[PDB]
Design a protein around this nucleic acid. Structure first.
Ligand SMILES: [Ca+2]
Ligand SMILES: [Ca+2]
Lengths: 106, 258, 155, 46, 75, 45
DNA sequence: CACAGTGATGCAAATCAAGTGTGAAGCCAGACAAAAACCCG
DNA sequence: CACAGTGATACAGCCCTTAACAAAAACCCG
């Protein structure tokens, strides 16, 4: 009774992909040095470019690099300091934004 | 090292592994390289304690803009003691670094403010108020109330601003709609009854001191300030032969409800 | 580094950088005391701060300035150094608190600083100048009389 | 307790003009005591 | 220079050009929201008039015609 | 100007206790006076 | 020649919308050049 | 029984990695 790949939890999806998980690990640690995440995002960017898309590619580049959709700690530190925000106030704002948006901006 | 090469050279090294991945995608999935690669990358991210980036990725996979309502930004700006200048600075900084809008600009907040201020909702007293106008859009009425300020009458050396009493009560009652609704729902009462509610309000007034004066033109005002406030303390409804309690201030002595 | 680039110089230069700073110190009143345990703190405060002014490298024969504060009287460039809740008139406590800083300053006035900027060891020298003092504190520190004295000038 | 808020709003959240500070402080202190806005800041407890 | 001889050979064995797969092993032996208004409905309804009555031009001329027609008439 | 900033920080940016108010105010003022953080606010050029 | 604010107001500039047909920058199958950075010769 | 803060510290909670089993939810056949 196969429903779909995304209709399973992380644990169940891991049980379902264990085969290729182990295979990619044991075949990227031999000659490619042994960095898993690097090979992962490289293969994803290749399969994305295959679809000749730029929007998604730039989005994942910004996410993986730390430049868009999410602030660096120094940036939010400068914002909190140069705006006289108290630590309690800033925590309240952070908690509210994380609760309503659902995405960690700070 | 690895994966640090440009195009036409990074595939040159992982070509075999991509071939194996697409072979498996044709074997089990049938060609669904997209989903299996995305899930493998999500798990590779979660393995190294990176829930933040992986959640951001699975959120941007949908392709929707994570924006905030102007009311939310207004509440954040008010309830965190932020001036308009500091909020504008933060807004500009975020929009220029992230390259997208997460907060609303100042005009949106100013526009959303008009819903909460008194003089926005219609109403009417069934017995018309004596010596009180029936217009229901007044805002900040002048405090002097048309007092003579010429040279012949008694000298005036004060300034004041204030709302209209009935409009203020209407705005206060409309600000607590969800509270009254949930209270009626929690007292085994239907949420569509229109009984004659009974509102109890507390009043307070006290003169301050050591109030510095500013330079510039205008009248010579003293260095003391007097304020007048009110507080909705309790609301009850007469259901049957009793007085069901539908609302009550949990923290009466707090400044958040004065 | 931006100043070095803008003046048509090389970034790998490690010549002796000449730095000049500005010192300041003033007392404060109406600093209320708090409840609880602790010593009997007076209701006053004295602050001490420093502020860089300009940096100049000796290139070739003459000098060329690399950086200088555009807003010398701004609050965004007044770096605090020492903070104590004392009285500016209490000479004993004032000296007991400020003597280590003066000792450090005197010791530094005759040394060079090897420092890494962008992966290159740079040489620094300092010139300390204290001008942010009112006449009252100058008279109290320089071993002079009060303002109502017959000698009126400190120059 | 609201006197404190008055002082702070007048010092930090109003136009520094003799004929504009009253209405600004009044509007800001009215907005600050809105349960509708306060409900947003407590949405995390849900 | 690596492409000139290849292009000449391509002209040669093409004068006797969509098969690149079976050509791989040939060179081996060679080198060796926003709700609209009345005006938007006007556009969406009257642009096909000029788009079908005179399709010989792009819809730039259709926009120009619809604009000079709206500016001359009322709303 | 630093005296004004000190009056503000001692009241709204420090622990209200004799044992730790001064360290908090000093650290916060040192962070505020820094230029590495002020460059992130000049993101208009 | 203090200065970073403090809010509103008023005007100038960017944009969006719907309309649609073409035009253009990629990727891709191998491949055998063209450097090109390691080894030392 | 005023109450919303106020910044550093500590600890619980909840995620994440080797484990083969083992219990819950469903079609091919009888
Ligand atoms: Ca009083
Ligand atoms: Ca002083």
């Amino acid at each position: 009774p196969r429903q779909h790949l995304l209709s399973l939890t992380r644990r169940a999806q891991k049980h379902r992909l264990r085969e290729l998980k182990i295979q990619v690990k044991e075949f990227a640690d031999k000659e490619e040095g042994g960095d898993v995440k690097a090979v992962c995002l490289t293969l994803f960017l290749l399969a994305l470019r295959a679809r000749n898309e730029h929007r998604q590619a730039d989005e994942l580049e910004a996410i993986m690099q730390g430049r868009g959709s999410g602030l660096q700690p120094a940036v939010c530190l400068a914002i909190r300091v140069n705006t006289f925000l108290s630590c309690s106030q800033y925590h309240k704002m952070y908690r509210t934004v994380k609760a309503i948006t659902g995405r960690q901006i700070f | 090292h690895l994966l640090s090469l440009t195009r036409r050279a990074q595939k040159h090294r992982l070509r075999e592994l991509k071939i194996q991945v697409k072979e498996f995608a044709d074997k089990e999935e049938g060609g669904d390289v997209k989903a299996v690669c995305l899930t493998l990358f999500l798990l590779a991210l979660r393995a190294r304690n990176e829930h933040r980036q992986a959640d951001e990725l699975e959120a941007i996979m949908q392709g929707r803009g994570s924006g905030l309502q102007p009311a939310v930004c207004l509440a954040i700006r008010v309830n965190t003691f932020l001036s308009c200048s500091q909020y504008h600075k933060m807004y500009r900084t975020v929009k220029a670094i992230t390259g997208r809008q997460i907060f609303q600009p100042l005009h949106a907040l100013r526009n959303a403010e008009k819903v909460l201020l008194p003089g926005y909702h219609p109403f009417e007293w069934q017995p018309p108020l004596k010596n009180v106008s029936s217009r229901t859009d007044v805002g900040i009425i002048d405090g002097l109330s048309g007092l003579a300020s010429s040279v012949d009458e008694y000298p005036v050396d004060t300034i004041a601003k204030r709302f209209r009493y009935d409009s203020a009560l209407v705005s206060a009652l409309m600000d607590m709609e969800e509270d009254i609704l949930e209270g009626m729902r929690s007292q085994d009462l239907d949420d569509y009854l229109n009984g004659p509610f009974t509102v109890v309000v507390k009043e307070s007034c006290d003169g301050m001191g050591d109030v510095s004066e500013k330079h510039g033109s205008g009248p010579a005002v003293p260095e003391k300030a007097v304020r007048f406030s009110f507080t909705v303390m309790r609301i009850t409804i007469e259901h049957g032969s009793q007085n069901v309690k539908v609302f009550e201030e949990p923290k009466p002595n707090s400044e958040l409800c004065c | 580094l931006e100043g070095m680039r803008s003046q048509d110089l090389d970034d790998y230069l490690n010549g002796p950088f000449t730095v000049v700073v500005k010192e300041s110190c003033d007392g404060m009143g109406d600093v209320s005391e708090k409840h609880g345990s602790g010593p009997a703190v007076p209701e006053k405060a004295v602050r001490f701060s420093f502020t860089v002014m300009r940096i100049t490298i000796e290139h070739g024969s003459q000098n060329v300035k690399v950086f200088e504060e555009p807003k010398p009287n701004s609050e965004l460039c007044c770096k605090p150094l020492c903070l104590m809740l004392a009285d500016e008139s209490d000479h004993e406590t004032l000296t007991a608190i400020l003597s280590p800083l003066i000792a450090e300053r005197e010791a530094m006035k005759s040394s060079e600083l090897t420092l890494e900027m962008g992966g290159i060891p740079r040489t620094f020298k300092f010139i300390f100048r204290g001008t942010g003092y009112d006449e009252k504190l100058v008279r109290e520190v320089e071993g002079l009389e009060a303002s109502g004295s017959v000698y009126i000038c400190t120059l | 307790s609201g006197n404190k808020l008055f002082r702070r709003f007048r010092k930090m959240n109003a136009r520094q003009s003799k004929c504009y500070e009253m209405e600004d402080v009044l509007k800001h202190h009215w907005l600050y005591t809105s349960k509708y806005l306060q409900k947003f800041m407590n949405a995390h407890n849900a | 220079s690596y492409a000139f001889f290849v292009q000449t050979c391509r002209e040669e064995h093409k004068k006797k050009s969509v098969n690149f797969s079976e050509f791989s092993k040939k060179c081996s032996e060679r080198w060796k929201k926003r709700p609209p208004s009345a005006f938007f409905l006007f556009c969406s309804e009257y642009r096909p008039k000029i788009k079908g009555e005179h399709p010989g031009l792009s819809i730039g001329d259709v926009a120009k015609k619809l604009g000079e027609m709206w500016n001359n008439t009322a709303a």
